[PDB]
Amino acid sequence: APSAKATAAKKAVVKGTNGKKALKVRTSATFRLPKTLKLARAPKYASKAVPHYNRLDSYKVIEQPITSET
Amino acid sequence: FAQFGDLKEVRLARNKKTGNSRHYGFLEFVNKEDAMIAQESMNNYLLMGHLLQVR
Numbered sequence: 779a780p781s782a783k784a785t786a787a788k789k790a791v792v793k794g795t796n797g798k799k800a801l802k803v804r805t806s807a808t809f810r811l812p813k814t815l816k817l818a819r820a821p822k823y824a825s826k827a828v829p830h831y832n833r834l835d836s837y838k839v840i841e842q843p844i845t846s847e848t
Numbered sequence: 849f850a851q852f853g854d855l856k857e858v859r860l861a862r863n864k865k866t867g868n869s870r871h872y873g874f875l876e877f878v879n880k881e882d883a884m885i886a887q888e889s890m891n892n893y894l895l896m897g898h899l900l901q902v903r
Contacts, residue, residue, distance in 0.1 A: 781882050784852040791889055 849875060852889075853882040871898070 789797065849855055860873030877883060886902070893900045 779879060779881055781853050781879065781885060783854075784882060784885055787851040788885060788889060790851075791893075 849877060849886065852886045853877045853879065 855877045858875045861870045890902055
């Protein structure tokens, strides 16, 4: 005979009935990388230790006027 | 032992004097196969510091 009630109890005592896994169905036939975190650049030091002063100020932009006859 | 099948009848050993158990007993559930699978399961089963043996 099967002793059907016992076979449940058979696996019960030696394993502990935690035999059911769960699965999540992947409807997509493919698989790509999960959108896991991408953290933010918060350094210890700064990259060049000084904000550079303005390189292209106006007094540098205009180099000369012209005094010519056109 | 209901769990291992329908049990027919059970009986254990109690003292006839200040009645308490001498720590053994007997059983038949119905079947030979039920008996042997229960034995295979609980052959050397454990609990606090007795351990059941079965025949």
